[PDB]
Design an enzyme around this catalytic site. Structure first.
Site, PDB file in Angstrom:
ATOM      1  N   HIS A  44       2.252  -7.597   7.321  1.00 13.58           N
ATOM      2  CA  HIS A  44       3.083  -7.459   8.234  1.00 13.58           C
ATOM      3  C   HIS A  44       2.994  -8.636   9.516  1.00 13.58           C
ATOM      4  CE1 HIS A  44       3.378  -3.269   6.825  1.00 13.58           C
ATOM      5  NE2 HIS A  44       4.670  -3.385   7.037  1.00 13.58           N
ATOM      6  N   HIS A  90       5.986 -12.445   6.340  1.00 12.99           N
ATOM      7  CA  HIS A  90       7.051 -11.305   6.238  1.00 12.99           C
ATOM      8  C   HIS A  90       8.214 -11.291   7.326  1.00 12.99           C
ATOM      9  CE1 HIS A  90       8.381  -7.137   5.496  1.00 12.99           C
ATOM     10  NE2 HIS A  90       8.158  -7.040   7.056  1.00 12.99           N
ATOM     11  N   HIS A 136      11.129  -7.936  13.925  1.00  9.72           N
ATOM     12  CA  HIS A 136      11.339  -6.597  13.624  1.00  9.72           C
ATOM     13  C   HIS A 136       9.762  -6.076  13.457  1.00  9.72           C
ATOM     14  CE1 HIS A 136      10.394  -7.500   9.488  1.00  9.72           C
ATOM     15  NE2 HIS A 136      10.345  -6.177   9.427  1.00  9.72           N
ATOM     16  N   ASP A 137       8.934  -6.733  13.373  1.00  9.72           N
ATOM     17  CA  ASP A 137       7.504  -6.248  13.059  1.00  9.72           C
ATOM     18  C   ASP A 137       6.438  -6.765  14.064  1.00  9.72           C
ATOM     19  OD1 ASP A 137       7.205  -4.119  11.142  1.00  9.72           O
ATOM     20  OD2 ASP A 137       7.312  -5.647   9.440  1.00  9.72           O
ATOM     21  N   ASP A 156      14.079  -5.903   4.755  1.00  4.71           N
ATOM     22  CA  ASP A 156      12.598  -5.456   4.933  1.00  4.71           C
ATOM     23  C   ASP A 156      11.825  -5.453   3.661  1.00  4.71           C
ATOM     24  OD1 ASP A 156      10.850  -2.607   6.844  1.00  4.71           O
ATOM     25  OD2 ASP A 156      10.446  -4.825   6.627  1.00  4.71           O
ATOM     26  N   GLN A 176       3.953   2.427  -7.126  1.00  2.00           N
ATOM     27  CA  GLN A 176       4.850   1.467  -7.253  1.00  2.00           C
ATOM     28  C   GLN A 176       6.321   2.122  -8.152  1.00  2.00           C
ATOM     29  OE1 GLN A 176       5.251  -1.707  -5.463  1.00  2.00           O
ATOM     30  NE2 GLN A 176       3.810  -0.253  -4.516  1.00  2.00           N
TER      31      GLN A 176
HETATM   32  O1  LIG Z   1       8.176  -5.045  -0.346  1.00  4.64           O
HETATM   33  N1  LIG Z   1       7.970  -4.033   0.324  1.00  4.64           N
HETATM   34  O2  LIG Z   1       8.527  -3.816   1.218  1.00  4.64           O
HETATM   35  C1  LIG Z   1       7.133  -2.748  -0.231  1.00  4.64           C
HETATM   36  C2  LIG Z   1       6.916  -2.969  -1.665  1.00  4.64           C
HETATM   37  C3  LIG Z   1       5.974  -1.843  -2.054  1.00  4.64           C
HETATM   38  C4  LIG Z   1       5.658  -0.947  -1.309  1.00  4.64           C
HETATM   39  N2  LIG Z   1       4.725   0.187  -1.643  1.00  4.64           N
HETATM   40  C5  LIG Z   1       4.723   0.850  -0.288  1.00  4.64           C
HETATM   41  N3  LIG Z   1       5.608   0.371   0.598  1.00  4.64           N
HETATM   42  C6  LIG Z   1       6.015  -0.809   0.002  1.00  4.64           C
HETATM   43  C7  LIG Z   1       6.585  -1.755   0.577  1.00  4.64           C
HETATM   44 NI    NI Z   2       8.765  -4.962   7.805  1.00  2.00          NI
HETATM   45 NI    NI Z   3       7.752  -2.339  10.186  1.00  2.00          NI
END
Ligand SMILES: O=[N+]([O-])c1ccc2[nH]cnc2c1
Ligand code: NI
Ligand code: NI
Ligand SMILES: O=[N+]([O-])c1ccc2[nH]cnc2c1
Length: 330
Positions: free
Chosen positions: A80, A84, A118-119, A229, A281
């Site tokens: 983050h 990003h 945003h982060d 995001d 995932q």
């Molecule tokens: O890319 N993402 O935002 C992303 C990908 C996989 C994730 N697993 C848990 N949060 C995730 C966010």
């Molecule tokens: Ni984000």
């Molecule tokens: Ni966030």
């Protein structure tokens, strides 16, 4: 403590930066990966604002100050972070370019800024952590805890001397854009995504969806924020896989802290449970990413390349589960 401020050298340097000509063409595409161009990231954001919003949208000096101070208020956390921020802003740029006239000048400028911010000041800990352990932020912000903080950080940066890129808007448009930015940042709370997507899906399927209806616009903008995001899942597989390494680096560090506080973390945040990552995932793509891009493509047909790429990456995680992975570098 306090809001960090860029140096004179930092912002004047950005002002004089020129983007290589070959990249102009590449930046327009959804699948563009900023990864190999780190020194260019702030310049890439300038280019994007200038092309979407116009070179006279913001005073150059104030814009460069704003961008470089934003960068300084992202922390050196594995995921983050500043990289990003820019990745998410690029996805929004690509969405806006492909759907330009659906959005107002005010919306496009607000949204690109909202994505970059945003982060802000993320510490590498989730809402779950902050609320479980009663961090002061959870006392102040009962729900969407970090997102309310990110919006507060945005306002802090705008209030720095010479950083208010929105000052030249009418008093009315100034209030409107800060509201666009607030709603967009809050919408990045994935907790709110599930309800938002469900609602939009229904409005779309029944044909009640109406972009002349402010509440509908807000929701569509919300789903755009989710799509941007999460866009690491829409890149080419090697990029998606490397980014996953960074996401999990954060997760495992939070899980470690929870162990120290006597609580077993969820498997996702447990570094001793890396075998469960591929199934995790798969879960995330099936429950979050695929539905997000599916509904987004229905509402905004030009965004289809995001969904097709997300689907390709789901297939890759499936290959991992079946034991078919080939050589990966980290
Ligand atoms: O890319 N993402 O935002 C992303 C990908 C996989 C994730 N697993 C848990 N949060 C995730 C966010
Ligand atoms: Ni984000
Ligand atoms: Ni966030
Ligand atoms: O390639 N460009 O640098 C480029 C092309 C079109 C533009 N419209 C506004 N700025 C632009 C930059």
């Amino acid at each position: 403590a306090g809001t960090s401020i860029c140096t004179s050298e930092e912002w004047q340097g950005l002002m004089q930066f020129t983007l290589p000509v070959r990249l102009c063409k590449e930046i327009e595409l959804f699948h563009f990966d900023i990864g190999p161009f780190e020194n260019m990231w702030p310049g890439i954001f300038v280019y994007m604002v200038h092309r979407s919003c116009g070179t006279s949208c913001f005073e150059l000096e104030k814009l460069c100050r704003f961008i470089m101070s934003v960068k300084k208020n992202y922390r050196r956390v594995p995921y983050h972070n500043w990289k990003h921020a820019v990745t998410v802003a690029h996805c929004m740029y690509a969405i806006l370019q492909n759907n330009h006239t659906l959005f107002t000048d005010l919306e496009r400028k607000g949204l690109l800024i909202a994505c970059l911010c945003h982060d802000l000041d993320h510490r590498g800990f989730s809402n779950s952590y902050l609320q479980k352990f009663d961090h002061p932020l959870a006392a102040l912000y009962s729900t969407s805890t970090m997102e309310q903080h990110h919006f507060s950080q945005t306002v802090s940066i705008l209030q720095l001397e010479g950083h208010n890129i929105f000052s030249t808007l009418s008093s009315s448009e100034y209030e409107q854009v800060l509201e666009i930015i607030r709603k967009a940042i809050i919408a990045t709370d994935l907790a709110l995504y599930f309800g938002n997507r469900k609602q939009l899906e229904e409005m779309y399927q029944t044909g009640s969806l109406n972009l002349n209806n402010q509440s509908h616009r807000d929701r569509v903008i919300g789903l755009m924020m989710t799509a941007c995001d999460l866009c690491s899942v829409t890149k080419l597989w090697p990029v998606t896989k490397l980014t996953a390494n960074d996401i999990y680096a954060e997760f495992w560090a939070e899980g470690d802290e929870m162990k120290k506080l006597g609580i077993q973390p969820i498997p996702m945040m447990d570094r001793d449970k890396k075998d469960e990552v591929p199934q995790g995932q798969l879960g995330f793509y099936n429950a979050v990413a695929i539905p997000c891009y599916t509904t987004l493509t229905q509402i905004l047909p030009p965004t289809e390349p995001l969904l097709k790429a997300c689907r390709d990456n789901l297939s890759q995680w499936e290959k991992v589960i079946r034991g078919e992975e080939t050589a990966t570098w980290i």
